[PDB]
Paper text:
Surface layers (S-layers) are resilient two-dimensional protein lattices that encapsulate many bacteria and most archaea. In archaea, S-layers usually form the only structural component of the cell wall and thus act as the final frontier between the cell and its environment. Sulfolobus acidocaldarius is a hyperthermophilic and acidophilic Crenarchaeon and thrives in acidic thermal soils and hot springs worldwide. The Sulfolobales S-layer lattice stands out from others because it is a two-component lattice, consisting of the S-layer-forming SlaA and the membrane anchor SlaB.
A pH shift from acidic (~pH 4) to alkaline (~pH 10) induces the disassembly of the lattice into its component subunits, while a reassembly occurs upon shifting the pH back to acidic. Asking whether this pH shift-induced assembly and disassembly mechanism is based on a conformational change or partial unfolding of SlaA, we investigated the structure of SlaA at different pH conditions. Purified SlaA proteins were frozen at pH 7 and 10 and their structure was determined using the SPA pipeline in Relion and 3.1. The resulting cryoEM maps had global resolutions of 3.9 Å for SlaA at pH 7 and 3.2 Å for SlaA at pH 10. As for SlaA at pH 4, domains D5 and D6 were too flexible to be resolved in the cryoEM maps. Strikingly, the cryoEM maps of SlaA30–1069 at the three pH conditions were virtually identical, demonstrating a remarkable pH stability of this protein. (root-mean-square deviation) value of C⍺ atoms between the pH 4 and 10 structures was 0.79 Å (min. = 0.02 Å; max. = 2.6 Å), confirming that SlaA30–1069 maintains its structure unchanged across a surprisingly broad pH range. This suggests that a pH-induced conformational change or unfolding in SlaA30–1069 is not the cause for S-layer disassembly. An analysis of the surface charges of SlaA, including the glycans, at pH 4, 7, and 10 revealed that the overall protein charge changes from positive at pH 4 to negative at pH 10. A comparison of the surface charge between glycosylated and non-glycosylated SlaA showed that the glycans contribute considerably to the negative charge of the protein at higher pH values. This change in electrostatic surface potential may be a key factor in disrupting protein–protein interactions within the S-layer, causing its disassembly at alkaline pH.
Author numbering: 30 to 1069
């Protein structure tokens, strides 16, 4: 039993799982294991147990945590049912608290209850009065006695009132019901008993929890200290960046086991926004197009092309040798009209190019001056209508011929040299909405905890409200008029006679980089002038959004019409009027974050609202969650370093990158993937993003929230793996066609997550390395994303929530010469390499080592930062690590030395020569010096014999100014330094001791040993590492 029941302890468990007879049942167990019992004397012991039990009960406000009512009771002297098991050694009782069975006992199958007490399968439980019995049943709550009052509980009490009335009271008054128990300490048989149960929750409404996080959602990083000033407010004003997960907890007392939930997010901004739009098609009656104009069709990102629609009375349009047949046909009250759809381009194309799938035209009906409309169709009455391309070389002109009513007309098109891109710039009130799902499980009923995406990759709709307006002029037999919409789109009506219709209109699409042409919305206005009691001028028009796929432009949904009416009895008149207008665009999965960021809904001023839905038991939340958005640029830093950092194998230079927008999952080393499907939400089905924790990618089938739902074999499973080459780098593997759809905390691949269009990413983010002078860079053109494994550091013990990510990425760099020319089979050690996890090795040759360097560049991983900060270059940062020059010296221990001594010290000192012990320098031939160091190891590679310098000359000046330079023959080096080898004095110290033989020097000169030999000694060495020479001297003295 989890949690445990203690020695001599009481404990309680709320009954749950399939086969549990009723809601609001709690069991109590007393661990009577500590004493002897038999059927002969059991009635004593069970009676002894029950009399000491006390039970407490409350009603609470589920949001605020306030106690509303409290009651406290004990079992009656008789009429209870209470039971014993010899096998599991417990006394126990079950009590039924909510309606029904508040007052009457409900039977409990011995099968079900045995799940908790398996002894009930081993043998029958004992009853009161000591018999074996086949069944267990509740003691009802209304039977018990008020400890305050010494009477059976009355129907007037608010707690018993509430418990019987929970069904509506949970929602209507935010009421929650809670119970706990305690066994008043007592002695039996020289043993004793004591305890208090953990609280159990009977019921509560379905809500976002509001304690301690008063917004229901929280960012673990803001709560710990790692975000500056904003940490002060983590409990009531949560923030998060664009593509990541934010944490939350729900209470659900209905469900059991795992539960799919679905969420609805609504995004909003204070004040109106300036938006860019572009013209896809212009549609008109042949009277409204101008006598001549110059035009050439534009081509959108998807590959679709702009078109021109002409409506006419005639069965053809005619142009000499060229005949143009209509695309479709319609009628208004028996009068017949045809629609011709044209692309002005390259050549007179006989077969179709693209289509409109369905298209609504709208007119004021004579019957009412109230809007009506129809779908234009083919002659065979099918819906999709062909569009055709026509034209020629630049500067060519075509005349088309047609009729409007009984009057012929001609229009002259000049095929322009450059595409006719046209824009509208409007201010709109805009808002958006989106949907999402995940499958949450719990270790602790009734609390379900999870995370959800800041921006789900799925269809989003963006919607707004604006104005349309007309100015008009009336005459005895005709009207003239103009309209404005979308701030600076203008349409103009040719003067309409009494008893004639005419049309104008536009299809428009957003004007930005990636998404142009992919979604659009159509407005067509019919107009009418007629006379009743007054002259009547009237407008009626469709508003309908569309999307483009496979050269079809299609009605996604169709909205309610609008109308305007102007009237006067006066023959001369000027008039004015206005109406609201609606505007809806729908996005597509790969494009959704980019779209929100471009339109301006995502930024430091954005606020989000969130509501939730339980798929299985069908409930919506009685409250909402709230959070706000953020955009933050990166920064780079390093711990101060000196010459020590490059001496010895256990030293390095640390660089830290601060970039919070690269943390997508708050657990460092966490991974999730995502796909798009239909989701159940309330009484409807909508598309939305489904999150799936792990390293695998799915193309799932069916509808999320029903038995139709099934996810097949993984299409790919990404992994970081060890690989070939010296050291052993860890790097990413997986089919990169699916890399958008995968999320991680590694900046060297994260920039793909939802940021790929036409198979290519919009941002080249992440880390870049270049190194000098031995020419090397990472990554090579050949490299996968995720060429190195690189993770954010995790929060430590005094932090409230340990083990969660900090925005710091900590990266370690080694530069050395000592392992140059080491080998690993065929491999030769040269240049730059990745090692372990966050580690780089740069290896160079001996003379190239001083002044060598690495430059690191960091570019942001998130498209919001590229958008708001492009102006200033604040989205990229640099740092450089370089090896400084150091002082070196050669010295005798004293300026003077006696010819009494046989030998003297001569010390060479240079920091960069220092290593682990032992290490030694062997001399020989023409003054060569060879460095050796068998205890040097670095990631398994080990140092080879290095030639670091040479002794240049060995000289004496004699007592008269004559100078002798001793030639560096083998015999001369042999005699002068019989200890041919120098030794390091202390670990990683720069110092070695040589010993120069004065008793040698005497004989070596062939001089009169002491007689003439008041002399000065002078010696010189050259090192390749600094490029300096070192020189040293001593006076040789004898008794005078
Ligand atoms: C905020 O919400 C975050 C949601 O993203 C939570 O992150 C999840 O953290 C889990 C562990 O958290 C525990 O420890 C932290 C301290 O770091 C505590 O604060 C928490 O209270 C909690 O105690 C983590 O679970 C995994 O690691 C556990 C080790 O601690 C281990 O016992 C589990 O078995 C998990 O492996 C989640 O990490 C991912 O978990 C999923 C499985 S599941 O989602 O847990 O069911 C793994 O997917 C699986 O991968 C295996 C490969 O071996 C496949 O075989 C299998 O098909 C597939 O399901 C992921 O690999 C693993 O990374 C982590 N969730 C995610 C998606 O990252 C976070 O804890 C919340 N914060 C707080 C304060 O509660
Ligand atoms: C969205 O709001 C975020 C919260 O303020 C902003 O994040 C903060 O970014 C600051 C640097 O960018 C600032 O300067 C730009 C022009 O140079 C301009 O776009 C904005 O003015 C923008 O805020 C950075 O603040 C530093 O610079 C400020 C100059 O305006 C100065 O007021 C600050 O004292 C600071 O030097 C923030 O970095 C953090 O600064 C903390 C100081 S405090 O602001 O908490 O007092 C410090 O404790 C911490 O170590 C350091 O990281 C940075 N804030 C955060 C949360 O890290 C963000 O830029 C706004 N986004 C937009 C769209 O502008
Ligand atoms: C698509 O079909 C259209 C309909 O038949 C064609 O439109 C006609 O275009 C003529 C020009 O096309 C010629 O020159 C092109 C080079 O710029 C070449 O690519 C074509 O192969 C073709 O040879 C145009 O003729 C006008 O321009 C001529 C310049 O070369 C010149 O002859 C005159 O200046 C002339 O006005 C047609 O316009 C009409 O021409 C009538 C005389 S005739 O040329 O038919 O003999 C004239 O009476 C009338 O005023 C004028 O409007 C024009 N036809 C119409 C009425 O649309 C188009 O070429 C086809 N496109 C391709 C290349 O496939
Ligand atoms: C949320 O997570 C729940 C787990 O916590 C999921 O329940 C598990 O469902 C498993 C199959 O999942 C697949 O089919 C679902 C449609 O029914 C679909 O919703 C899922 O997305 C997914 O495509 C199921 O595993 C059984 O079937 C497997 C074949 O797919 C087979 O490999 C298994 O051996 C197993 O028979 C689990 O159901 C039950 O599992 C018992 C234990 S075990 O064998 O898994 O160890 C088994 O004894 C019993 O016969 C079987 O019915 C089930 N897991 C558990 C432990 O309950 C749930 O589907 C998820 N909900 C959604 C909507 O995604
Ligand atoms: C440390 O760096 C020093 C500076 O770069 C290197 O110094 C160079 O020394 C070369 C001789 O060293 C060779 O033999 C060693 C055996 O004792 C061996 O350990 C070395 O790996 C290396 O192979 C010297 O090269 C010349 O002398 C050779 C006679 O031994 C002869 O065979 C060569 O043909 C060559 O003339 C370099 O001196 C300069 O060399 C120039 C050409 S190049 O060798 O640099 O390509 C030449 O144009 C010029 O006239 C001559 O003075 C000398 N390099 C420089 C630029 O001073 C030292 O070897 C490195 N130590 C190690 C072990 O890495
Ligand atoms: C419709 O869709 C396409 C494809 O995304 C887009 O073309 C690309 O536009 C960018 C810049 O976009 C902005 O400026 C143009 C006007 O120049 C506006 O129309 C847009 O609304 C944007 O405000 C061009 O610069 C691209 O040319 C490429 O530039 C790259 C550098 S970049 O950082 O500037 O993008 C170079 O690396 C490429 O070599 C070069 O081709 C252009 N891309 C292509 C493939 O032509 C259109 O502008 C969009 N048109 C509409 C209606 O807005
Ligand atoms: C565009 O013109 C089309 C004709 O070119 C119109 O299509 C016709 O629509 C009628 C009424 O909806 C439909 O019944 C016709 O189908 C034919 O019906 C014939 C019998 S009858 O209707 O002539 O009495 C049958 O011979 C046979 O079932 C169909 O051929 C349909 N006509 C054709 C030729 O398909 C269409 O209505 C028009 N669009 C508008 C809105 O004006
Ligand atoms: C839109 O244009 C149509 C032309 O394709 C018009 O069609 C006309 O049909 C009417 C019957 O409704 C018929 O009287 C016409 O027949 C011709 O009459 C000519 C002279 S006139 O009467 O138009 O002045 C003669 O020249 C000729 O030999 C006849 O064939 C017919 N008009 C034509 C010229 O064919 C129609 O008026 C119009 N519809 C709408 C919606 O207003
Ligand atoms: C009363 O006290 C006993 C002393 O604390 C204690 O027994 C110890 O705990 C477990 C045995 O009980 C559990 O395990 C079984 C499943 O194997 C369940 O059926 C049961 O409900 C309990 O969860 C055992 O591991 C441990 O060795 C025992 N310790 C010793 C040495 O006595 C019981 O936990 C408690 N009595 C009962 C039966 O609940
Ligand atoms: C219930 O009855 C049993 C006897 O049936 C009691 O167990 C005996 O107790 C004595 C001392 O108390 C022990 O020395 C024996 O080992 C036990 N005998 C048997 C037969 O087990 C038990 O103590 C009684 N319990 C109570 C509380 O009265
Ligand atoms: C979030 O947006 C949704 C739009 O889906 C809104 O919910 C709608 O409410 C309107 C009336 O305000 C009703 O016509 C619909 O029944 C609701 N829509 C659907 C599809 O359920 C609502 O405006 C926003 N909700 C919140 C949390 O404010
Ligand atoms: C490295 O080792 C040398 C050993 O020669 C150290 O030199 C000695 O320094 C102390 C004081 O620090 C003097 O008392 C001695 O006289 C020096 N020895 C000789 C032979 O002169 C040197 O201090 C060490 N340096 C570092 C950086 O560890
Ligand atoms: C390290 O610094 C030393 C000292 O300034 C440099 O060597 C000196 O400068 C020139 C070389 O251009 C020589 O002629 C002198 O003899 C050197 N001076 C001394 C004190 O002997 C050296 O250039 C620097 N090393 C590197 C490679 O950066
Ligand atoms: C759009 O045109 C194409 C012809 O390529 C056809 O696939 C489709 O039936 C039309 N409309 C739709 C998507 O119904």
């Amino acid at each position: 039993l989890t949690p445990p029941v203690s020695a001599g302890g009481i404990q309680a468990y709320l009954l749950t799982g399939s086969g549990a007879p009723a809601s609001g049942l709690v069991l109590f167990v007393v661990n009577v294991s500590n004493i002897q019992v038999s059927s002969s004397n059991v009635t004593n012991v069970i009676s002894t147990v029950v009399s000491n039990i006390q039970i407490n009960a409350k009603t609470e406000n589920a949001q605020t945590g306030a106690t509303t009512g409290s009651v406290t009771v004990r079992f009656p002297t008789s009429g209870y049912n209470a039971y014993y098991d010899s096998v599991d050694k417990v006394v126990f009782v079950v009590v039924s608290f909510l309606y029904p069975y508040t007052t009457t006992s409900v039977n409990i199958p011995l099968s079900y209850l045995s799940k908790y007490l398996p002894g009930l399968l081993t043998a029958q439980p004992y009853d009161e009065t000591g018999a074996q019995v086949t069944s267990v049943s509740s003691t009802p709550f209304g039977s018990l006695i008020d400890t305050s009052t010494g009477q059976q509980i009355l129907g007037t009490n608010p707690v018993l009132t509430s418990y019987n009335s929970y069904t509506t009271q949970a929602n209507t008054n935010m009421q929650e019901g809670v119970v706990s128990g305690t066994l008043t300490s007592f002695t039996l048989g020289g043993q004793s008993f004591s305890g208090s149960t953990v609280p159990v929750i009977l019921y509560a409404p379905f809500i976002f929890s509001n304690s301690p996080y008063q917004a229901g959602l929280y960012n673990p990083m803001q709560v710990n200290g790692n975000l500056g000033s904003l940490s002060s407010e983590a409990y009531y004003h949560p923030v998060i960046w664009g593509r990541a997960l934010i944490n939350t907890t729900l209470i659900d007392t209905y469900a059991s086991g795992s539960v799919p939930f679905t969420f609805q997010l609504n995004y909003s901004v204070p004040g109106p926004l300036t938006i860019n739009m572009a013209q896809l098609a212009w549609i008109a009656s042949i009277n409204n197009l101008p006598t001549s104009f110059t035009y050439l069709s534009y081509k959108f990102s998807n590959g679709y092309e702009s078109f021109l629609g002409i409506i006419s009375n005639s069965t053809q349009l005619t142009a000499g040798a060229l005949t143009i047949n209509p695309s479709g046909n319609f009628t208004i009250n028996g009068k017949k009209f045809y629609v011709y759809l044209l692309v002005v381009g390259s050549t007179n194309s006989t077969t179709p190019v693209e289509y409109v799938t369905k298209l609504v035209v709208e007119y004021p009906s004579s019957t009412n001056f109230l809007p009506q409309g129809v779908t234009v169709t083919t002659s065979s009455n099918k819906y999709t209508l062909p569009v055709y391309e026509i034209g020629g070389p630049a500067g060519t002109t075509i005349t088309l011929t047609g009729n409007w009513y009984s009057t012929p007309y001609t229009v002259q098109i000049t095929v322009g040299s450059t595409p006719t891109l046209t824009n509208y710039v409007s201010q709109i009130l805009l808002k958006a909405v989106a949907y999402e799902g995940i499958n949450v499980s719990t270790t602790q009923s009734p609390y379900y905890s999870t995370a959800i995406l800041s921006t789900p990759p799925s269809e989003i709709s963006i919607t707004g409200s604006s104005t349309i307006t007309a100015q008009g002029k009336l005459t005895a037999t005709s009207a003239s008029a103009t309209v404005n919409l979308l701030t600076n789109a203008t349409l103009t009506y040719e003067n309409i006679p009494l008893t004639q219709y005419s049309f104008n209109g536009i299809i428009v699409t957003p004007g930005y980089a990636a998404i142009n042409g992919t979604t659009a919305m159509a407005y067509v206005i019919g107009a009418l002038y007629n006379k009743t009691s007054d002259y009547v001028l009237s407008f009626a028009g469709s508003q309908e959004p569309m999307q483009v796929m496979n050269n079809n432009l299609t009605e996604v949904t169709t909205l309610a019409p609008f109308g305007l009416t102007l009237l006067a009895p006066s023959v001369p008149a000027t008039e004015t009027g206005t109406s609201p207008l609606q505007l809806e665009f729908f996005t597509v999965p790969s494009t959704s974050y980019i779209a929100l960021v471009d339109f301006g809904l995502w930024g430091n001023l954005t606020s989000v609202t969130v509501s939730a839905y339980d798929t299985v038991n069908n409930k919506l939340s009685v409250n909402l969650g709230y959070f706000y958005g953020i955009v933050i640029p990166p920064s780079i830093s390093t711990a101060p370093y000196n010459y020590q950092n490059f001496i010895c194998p256990n030293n390095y230079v640390t660089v830290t990158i601060y970039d919070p927008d690269a943390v997508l999952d708050p657990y460092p080393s966490g991974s999730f993937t995502t796909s798009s499907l239909p989701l159940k939400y309330g009484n409807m089905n909508i598309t939305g993003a489904v999150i799936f924790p792990g390293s695998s990618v799915y193309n799932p089938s069916g509808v999320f929230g029903y038995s139709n739902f099934n996810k097949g074999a993984a299409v790919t499973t990404f992994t970081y793996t060890a690989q070939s080459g010296p050291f052993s780098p860890v790097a990413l593997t997986g089919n990169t066609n699916y890399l958008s759809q995968y999320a991680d905390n590694n900046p060297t691949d994260n920039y793909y997550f939802i940021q790929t269009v036409n198979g290519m990413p919009v941002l080249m983010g992440g880390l870049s390395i270049v190194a000098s002078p031995v020419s090397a860079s990472l990554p090579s053109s050949t490299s996968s994303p995720g060429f190195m494994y690189l993770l954010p550091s995790a929060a430590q013990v005094p932090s409230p929530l340990p083990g969660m990510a900090t925005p710091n990425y900590n990266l370690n760099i080694y530069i050395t010469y000592k392992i140059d020319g080491a080998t690993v089979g065929n491999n030769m050690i040269n240049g730059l390499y990745v090692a372990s996890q966050n580690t780089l090795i740069y290896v160079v040759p001996n003379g190239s080592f001083v002044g060598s360097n690495i430059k690191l560049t960091y570019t942001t991983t998130d498209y919001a930062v590229l958008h708001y900060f492009y102006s200033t270059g604040q989205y990229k940062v640099f740092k450089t690590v370089s090896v400084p020059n150091v002082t070196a010296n050669l010295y005798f221990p004293s300026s003077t030395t006696p010819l009494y001594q046989l030998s003297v010290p001569l010390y060479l000192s240079e920091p960069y020569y220092g290593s682990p012990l032992p290490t030694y320098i062997g001399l020989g031939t023409n003054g060569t010096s060879l460095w050796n160091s068998p205890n040097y190891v670095l990631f398994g590679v080990s140092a080879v014999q290095q030639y670091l310098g040479f002794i240049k000359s060995i000289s004496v000046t004699l007592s008269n100014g004559t100078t002798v330079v001793i030639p560096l023959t083998t015999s001369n080096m042999q005699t002068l330094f019989p200890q041919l080898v120098g030794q390091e004095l202390q670990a990683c110290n720069g110092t070695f001791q040589f010993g120069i033989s004065i008793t040698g020097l005497e004989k070596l000169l062939n001089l009169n040993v002491q007689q003439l030999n008041n002399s000065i000694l002078s010696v010189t060495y050259h090192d390749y590492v600094t490029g300096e020479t070192l020189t040293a001297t001593t006076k040789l003295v004898a008794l005078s």
